[PDB]
């Protein structure tokens, strides 16, 4: 709450409120000097004193939240709180130690937005590529990736990765999702595992437990099985 004030309808009451409840002498004494006063005290020919000789506000004894009560969702409690993301955090630290620019593929790109926030947060240089970017921007940002050896993580739509794009400079794959068609998943894998591929690219398919993506994994695996036995 703000402190209680007096509703008295004279001008003198307003002047006394703005001279007691605010009282600019104490504010000047507490926060410090005006930068104009700093300039006239530091370009003069002789040393001169300052009436707040330093900023007399005490140093707050809690670094993340000082003198307010405002709460930002903390980064660990913000987007982390998921095991997929937790193991992804571990393996992204591991591949940073490995020094390999990897990938993402996902179905619903709002997850890709929230992962963008996570990766800007934990300081990883990244690039984004969905269907929403125009075609010249698509080819130019994938060219800018494939010419630069340092930008560390992609963002892609899984199904719209089935273009004629080139990812030889990529060297590792992470699927955050395992949805129905194996040929889309293997097609994006082929978009990594290209004809110009130099080294072994490993692919990490993140799996939960007891949940529906294991079902989709099994169903897709059976469909892959029938496909491969028929046209082998």
């Amino acid at each position: 709450a703000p402190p209680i004030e007096v509703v008295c309808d004279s001008r003198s009451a307003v002047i006394e409120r703005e001279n007691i409840m605010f009282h600019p002498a104490m504010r000047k004494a507490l926060f410090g000097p005006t930068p104009s006063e700093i300039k006239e005290a530091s370009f003069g020919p002789r040393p001169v004193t300052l009436y707040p000789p330093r900023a007399l506000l005490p140093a707050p004894d809690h670094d993340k939240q000082r003198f307010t009560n405002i709460t930002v969702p903390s980064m660990a409690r913000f987007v982390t709180d998921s095991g997929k993301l937790a193991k992804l955090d571990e393996l992204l630290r591991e591949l940073k130690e490995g020094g390999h620019r990897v990938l993402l593929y996902f179905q619903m790109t709002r997850m890709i937005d929230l992962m963008e926030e996570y990766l800007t947060y934990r300081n990883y240089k990244y690039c984004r590529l969905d269907g929403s970017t125009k075609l010249e921007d698509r080819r130019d940002t994938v060219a800018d990736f494939q010419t630069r050896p340092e930008i560390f993580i992609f963002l892609l739509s899984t199904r719209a990765g089935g273009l004629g794009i080139n990812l030889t400079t990529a060297d590792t794959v992470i699927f955050y999702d395992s949805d129905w068609n194996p040929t889309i998943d293997s097609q994006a894998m082929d978009r990594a595992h290209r004809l110009g591929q130099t080294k072994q690219v490993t692919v990490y398919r993140l799996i939960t437990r007891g949940t529906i993506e294991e079902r989709i994994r099994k169903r897709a695996l059976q469909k892959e099985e029938v496909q491969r036995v028929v046209i082998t």
């Binding site: 703000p2 969702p73 997929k84 179905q107 619903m108 997850m111 929230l114 949940t211």
Partner: protein, 67 residues
Amino acid sequence: IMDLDSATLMNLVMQFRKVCNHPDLFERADTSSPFFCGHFAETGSFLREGTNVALGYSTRSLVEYRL
């Protein structure tokens, strides 16, 4: 409760998928604060004060004392 809200069947299956992915896609509260007891000044609209606006310290208590 639905075999016997937000009851779409693909809300069911693909939100099983989403809650594999990340829970905050299903709606999350934005950055909070404590409740405020006093009387501020509400902005009228967004399409009037275009670029050069001035904030005013409008914080008064609803508790008044009339003299």
